[PDB]
RNA sequence: AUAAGUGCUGAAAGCAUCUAAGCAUGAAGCCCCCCUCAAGAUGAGAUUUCCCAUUCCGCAAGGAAGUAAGAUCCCUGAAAG
RNA sequence: GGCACCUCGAUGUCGGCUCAUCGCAUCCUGGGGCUGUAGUCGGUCCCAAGGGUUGGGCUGUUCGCCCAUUAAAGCGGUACGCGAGCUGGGUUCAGAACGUCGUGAGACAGUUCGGUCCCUAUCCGUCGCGGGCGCAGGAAAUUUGAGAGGAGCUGUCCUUAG
C-alpha cells in the first residue's frame, strides 16, 4: 500500500476508485496500490 | 442501466414466483433460491421474459436496477445450469482429499486443514491437485472457493499454493 | 392574580407512546414536554404538573444518518482512564430502555424537580407494559 | 459444576506413589445438605442452597428452623449457594458428601483470607520503602499523592488501611485424597483463611 | 462484534470494480469469558422462612403503652480488631 | 527564544527517591500491505495504547559514553508531575583559597573546600472503619447484578523438520 495525501495513477493501468469514501488506486502492479491518508 | 434494461429469458424448466415485498423464489432442476429485493424495483414476468423497471433515474435506482437484474439472472442460471468454481493446488506434496463431506487440504502445514461446506454447496476432488466447488448460488460458490483459496493463497516466487483455475499469479524471481 | 398548580390541584393522566419507527430525538423532545406538563394550561414552573409516560417498543426506535454505528454513548467511571463507550447500535440492542431514558433525561430540567419529573417516565423494550392498573391512553406524536 | 462446603482443618503432607512430597490442606466437610432449589421460574436463575455444620438449637432461631424444615435437617451454621449445578441431580434434603470429588480432580477453592487489621502501604500494597539512611526521613510512607494539575488525589491512589479478610478463590488445585469415613478432602496447596474457616470447594471453572 | 487488511457476489459505468444494495473474514485491542466489590441501583430489586393483628386515649385522623418474632446492653473471648 | 498578561503583604528552583497517571508521533509483543520480501534476517508504511519496557561503571548531574543483559531497554504531558511526601550532591547568603580582572574595596555562567530544608491537617480529595435514617408491618437468612474495580506481559527448548 501507499497511504498518502496525493493519490494518482503511476502507470496507465492504474485505476482510481472510491471505496468507503476514500480515494484509492488499484493496479495489477501491487506497488501502485494506493489509499488516500 | 444497459444491464438493468436487458431482458431476461426464463428457460422452460425454471419457474420464477414473485411473492410479497419483492421476494422472488426461483425453482429449477438443481433446486430453489429465495431472495428479497429492494421495494422500489419493479420486477415483471411476461411470456417467460423477466424485466426489471426502475422508478426514477436517481443514482440509487440506476444502481439498484442493474444489480436486481444481474442477481435474478444469476438465480435463473444457478437453478438451471449451476455454478462451478475450480481450484488448482500447485506444490510438491500439495494434495486435496475428500473425507465424507469435508475437504481435507494438505498444503505444507504441520497439520491438515479441514473445510466443511455449507448447505447447498458440493466440493468435488477429481484429482489430488484439483478441487471443484459446485452449487446454485453464485455468491456462495464464490465464497467457499475463496475460503479454500485462503488456506494457502498462491505465492509469487514459485506460484505455489491454491489458485483459481486460469488464475494468472504474478511471479517474482527469487535468487 | 395568576393561578398556581400545587399537589392538591394537580391530576396526572397516564399516556402510552409507541416508539416503533420513531426518531430518537423527535420522540424524546415530545415526551419530555409531556413529562414536564407543558401541554397543560395549569402548567406551573415550580411544581410537577406533567403526565406519566409509558414508552413501549423502545428497541424499535430509529436513528437517521450513520448514527447507529457512529453515535457513541460515553461515560466516565471517575477513575483515571475510566472512559467507557457504547455505540447507539449496542445501546439499542442491549440497553434500549437506557437509550430512551438517556435521551429524555438530557431534555428535562436538571435540578430536584427535573429529577422528579423523570420518575414518571417508564420505558419498556417490547410491546407490553405492566401498568394496566393505571389505565393508560394512547398518545400519538404530534410530530 | 459440583460443589461442597467444608472447614479448613490445617495443612500437613503426603508422599505420592512416585515418592514426591505433596503439601495438602485438610478440609473437613461433614455432609452438606440441600436446603433450597432455586429455579428460573421462581427466583429467575437456577441454583441450589447447601447447608453445612450442625448448629445447636440454642444458637438457632425460628426463621432458621422454619427454613430447613422442608429438607428435614437441623439448622445449618453455614449456608452458601451453588449456581450452574445440574438441577435434576439434586433434591431438597439430599446429602452432598466429599466422595462427589475424586483424587486427581481439579478444583477451585474459596475462603475468607486471614485478616491482618490495619496495615501500611508497604505490606498492604507491596510498595517499596524509601532509603533507611543517607539522611532520609522517608522509610515506609506511601509515596506522592500524585500530580498537581488536578488539585485532587486520583481515586485509586493506594493507601494504608484494613487488610485481609477478603473473599479469595484459588483455582486449579488438585484433590490428592478423599476420606469419607472422616469426611475429608486433601488438596495440593494452601487455601485462603484460618483454621476452622469456611471453605467452599467446587469443580474448577476453567476445565 | 470490530480495526488495518483480505475478499465474495455486484451495479452505477454492456467492461472492470471489496460497496452503492447484499454477504463474509479478520488483531495482545473493544464487549464478554476469569477474579473481587456491589440494591443509598432513593430505579432502594428477588427468593425462603418467622411473628400476627394486642391494650389505651381521641369524634376520627393520629398519638401513647405493654409486647411477638427478633436483637441489643452487660459479660467470656479470638479465627476478628 | 519573543511578549511581560497572573503571582514580589513569597507561586521553593536542578538531579535523585516514593507514588504514579495520561497522550500516541509504537520500543517490545498482536494483526496487516508493499518490498531492491528465496529462506533465516530485515526495510518501509498501515491498524493497534492491553500489558510490558533491566542491573551496573563515570559524573551533583539531566544528558551522554561505557560494561553486561533484555522480547524490548519507546518518545512525550501532568507547575520541565510529585520538597505542608523524602533527599539536598549541584545551583544560589555569610568563611577560606587558586587563576584572572581591578590602584582599591572587590569581582567572575571560572574553579575549589565548608556551610540550619519549619508546620499538631480545618475543608475538599484519597484510603479504611462505624453510627443514623431510608427502602409503606416488624424480623432471620440466602441472593440477582444496574454499576464499579482487578487481571491483561513474555522468553527459551523440544517436536513438526534438518
Ligand atoms: K514573586
Ligand atoms: K513550578
Ligand atoms: K523539604
Ligand atoms: K503545597
Ligand atoms: K475547601
- What does the H/E/C string look like for B22-44? HEEEEEECCEEEEEECCCCCEEE
The DSSP line for D107-139 is EEEEEEPPP-EEE-HHHHHTPPP--SSTT---S
Element (H, E) at C91: helix C88-94
Q: What is the DSSP letter of B69?
A: H
Q: Which chain C residues are within 8 Å of D154, Cβ to Cβ?
A: 79-80
Measure, in angstroms, how far nucleotide F152 C1' is from residue D192 CA. 24
Chain E nucleotides reached by a protein CB under 7 Å: 4-24, 30-31, 34-37, 43, 46-51, 69-71, 79-81
What's the CA gap between C106 and C100, in Å, rounded? 10
Contact C135, C30 (CB under 8 A): no
Residues of chain B with CATH 3.90.930.12: 15-81, 83-164
What's the CA gap between B2 and B102, in Å, rounded? 42
Cβ atoms within 10 Å, residue B39: 9
Look at chain C and report how many structural domains it folds into: 1
Among D124, D67, D73, D85, which Cα is nearest to D2's?
D85
Q: Cα–chain-centroid distance for residue D100?
A: 18
Cell numbers of D22, please? 505433596
- Going from the Cα of D152 to the center of ligand 2, the distance in angstroms, rounded, reads 17
Chains C and B in direct contact, meaning 3 or more beta-carbon pairs closer than 8 angstroms? no
Q: What is the DSSP letter of D89?
A: G
Q: Chain C interface residues facing chain D, Cβ-Cβ under 8 Å?
A: 78-80
What's the CA gap between B144 and B124, in Å, rounded? 12
Write the CB contacts of B46 (distance below 8 Å, at least 6 apart in sequence): none
- Going from the Cα of D133 to the center of ligand 3, the distance in angstroms, rounded, reads 17
3-class DSSP state of C36: helix
Cα-based torsion angle of the residue sequence C6, C7, C12, C17 in order, rounded to the nearest 10 degrees: 80
Q: Is C125 exposed, middle or buried (0-12, 13-18, 19+ CB in 10 A)?
A: middle
Q: What is the DSSP letter of A10?
A: S
Q: Does D156 touch chain C (CB under 8 A)?
A: yes
Cβ atoms within 10 Å, residue C39: 15
In CATH, the number for domain B83-164 is 3.90.930.12
C32: containing domain: 2-143
What's the CA gap between D49 and D33, in Å, rounded? 8
Contact C53, C32 (CB under 8 A): no
**Residue found by looking up cell 476420606 in the block:** D179
Task: Report resolution in angstroms.
Answer: 3.4
Question: To which CATH superfamily is domain B15-81 assigned?
Answer: Ribosomal protein L6 (3.90.930.12)
Give CB contacts under 8 A, 24+ apart, made by B108-111.
B108/B152, B108/B160, B109/B152
Residues in D 135-154 with any Cβ partner in C closer than 8 A: 154
Instruction: Please list the alpha-helical segments (H only) found in chain D.
Output: 62-68, 121-125
Phi, psi angles (nearest 5°) of residue B47:
65, 45
SS3 content of chain A, % helix, strand, coil (to 5): 0, 40, 60
Phi, psi angles (nearest 5°) of residue D161:
-175, -160
Closest Cα in chain D to C78: D155
Q: What is the DSSP letter of B83?
A: E
Sheet harboring B8-9: ordered strands across? B8-9, B49-53, B42-45
What's the CA gap between B43 and C31, in Å, rounded? 42
- Going from the Cα of D148 to the center of ligand 2, the distance in angstroms, rounded, reads 10
Among D44, D40, D36, D50, which Cα is nearest to D82's?
D50
Q: Which chain D residues are within 8 Å of C79, Cβ to Cβ?
A: 154-156
How was this structure determined? It was done by cryo-EM
Amino acid at each position: 500500500m501507499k497511504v498518502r495525501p496525493s493519490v494518482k495513477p503511476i502507470c496507465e493501468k492504474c485505476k482510481v476508485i472510491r471505496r468507503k469514501g476514500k480515494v484509492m488506486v488499484i493496479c495489477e502492479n501491487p506497488k501502485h496500490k494506493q489509499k488516500q491518508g | 442501466s444497459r444491464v438493468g434494461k436487458k431482458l431476461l429469458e426464463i428457460p422452460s424448466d425454471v419457474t420464477v414466483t414473485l411473492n410479497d415485498n419483492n421476494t422472488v423464489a426461483v425453482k429449477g432442476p438443481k433446486g430453489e433460491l429465495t431472495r428479497t429485493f429492494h421495494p422500489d424495483m419493479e420486477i415483471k414476468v411476461e411470456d417467460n421474459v423477466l424485466t426489471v423497471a426502475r422508478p426514477s433515474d436517481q443514482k440509487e435506482h440506476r444502481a439498484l436496477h442493474g444489480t436486481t437484474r444481474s442477481l435474478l439472472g444469476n438465480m435463473v442460471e444457478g437453478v438451471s445450469k449451476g455454478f462451478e468454481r475450480g481450484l488448482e493446488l500447485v506444490g510438491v506434496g500439495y494434495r486435496a482429499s475428500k473425507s465424507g463431506n469435508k475437504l481435507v487440504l494438505n498444503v505444507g502445514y504441520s497439520h491438515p486443514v479441514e473445510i466443511v461446506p455449507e448447505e447447498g454447496i458440493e466440493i468435488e476432488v477429481p484429482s489430488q491437485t484439483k478441487v471443484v466447488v459446485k452449487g446454485t448460488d453464485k455468491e456462495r460458490v464464490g465464497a467457499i472457493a475463496a475460503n479454500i483459496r485462503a488456506v494457502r493463497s498462491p505465492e509469487p516466487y514459485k506460484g505455489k499454493g491454491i489458485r483459481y483455475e486460469g488464475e494468472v499469479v504474478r511471479r517474482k524471481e527469487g535468487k | 392574580t395568576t393561578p398556581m398548580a400545587n399537589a392538591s390541584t394537580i391530576e396526572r393522566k397516564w399516556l402510552v407512546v409507541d416508539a416503533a419507527g420513531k426518531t430518537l430525538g423527535r420522540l424524546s423532545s415530545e415526551v419530555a414536554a409531556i413529562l414536564r406538563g407543558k401541554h397543560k394550561p395549569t402548567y406551573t414552573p415550580h411544581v410537577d404538573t406533567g403526565d406519566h409516560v409509558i414508552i413501549i417498543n423502545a428497541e424499535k426506535i430509529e436513528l437517521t444518518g450513520k448514527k447507529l454505528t457512529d453515535k457513541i454513548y460515553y461515560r466516565h467511571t471517575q477513575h483515571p482512564g475510566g472512559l467507557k463507550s457504547r455505540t447507539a447500535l449496542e445501546m439499542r440492542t442491549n440497553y434500549p430502555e437506557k437509550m430512551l431514558e438517556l435521551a429524555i433525561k438530557g431534555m428535562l430540567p436538571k435540578g430536584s424537580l427535573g429529577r422528579q419529573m423523570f420518575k414518571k417516565l417508564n420505558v419498556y423494550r417490547g410491546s407490553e407494559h405492566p401498568h394496566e392498573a393505571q389505565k393508560p391512553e394512547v398518545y400519538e406524536l404530534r410530530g | 459444576t459440583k460443589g461442597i462446603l467444608g472447614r479448613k482443618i490445617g495443612m500437613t503432607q503426603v508422599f505420592a506413589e512416585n515418592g514426591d512430597l505433596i503439601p495438602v490442606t485438610v478440609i473437613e466437610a461433614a455432609p452438606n445438605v440441600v436446603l433450597q432449589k432455586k429455579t428460573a421460574e421462581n427466583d429467575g436463575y437456577e441454583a441450589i442452597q447447601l447447608g453445612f455444620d450442625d448448629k445447636r438449637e440454642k444458637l438457632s432461631n425460628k426463621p432458621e428452623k422454619g427454613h430447613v424444615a422442608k429438607a428435614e435437617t437441623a439448622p445449618k451454621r453455614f449456608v452458601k449457594e451453588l449456581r450452574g449445578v445440574e438441577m435434576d441431580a439434586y433434591e431438597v434434603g439430599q446429602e452432598v458428601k466429599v466422595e462427589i470429588f475424586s483424587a486427581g480432580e481439579i478444583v477451585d477453592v474459596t475462603g475468607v483470607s486471614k485478616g491482618k487489621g490495619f496495615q501500611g502501604a508497604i505490606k498492604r500494597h507491596g510498595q517499596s520503602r524509601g532509603p533507611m539512611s543517607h539522611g532520609s526521613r522517608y522509610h515506609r510512607r506511601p509515596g506522592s499523592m500524585g500530580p498537581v494539575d488536578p488539585n485532587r488525589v486520583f481515586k485509586g491512589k493506594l493507601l494504608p488501611g484494613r487488610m485481609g479478610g477478603e473473599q479469595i478463590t484459588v483455582q486449579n488445585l488438585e484433590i490428592v485424597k478423599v476420606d469419607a469415613e472422616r469426611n475429608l478432602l486433601l488438596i495440593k496447596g494452601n487455601v485462603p483463611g484460618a483454621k476452622k474457616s469456611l471453605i467452599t470447594v467446587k469443580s474448577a471453572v476453567k476445565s
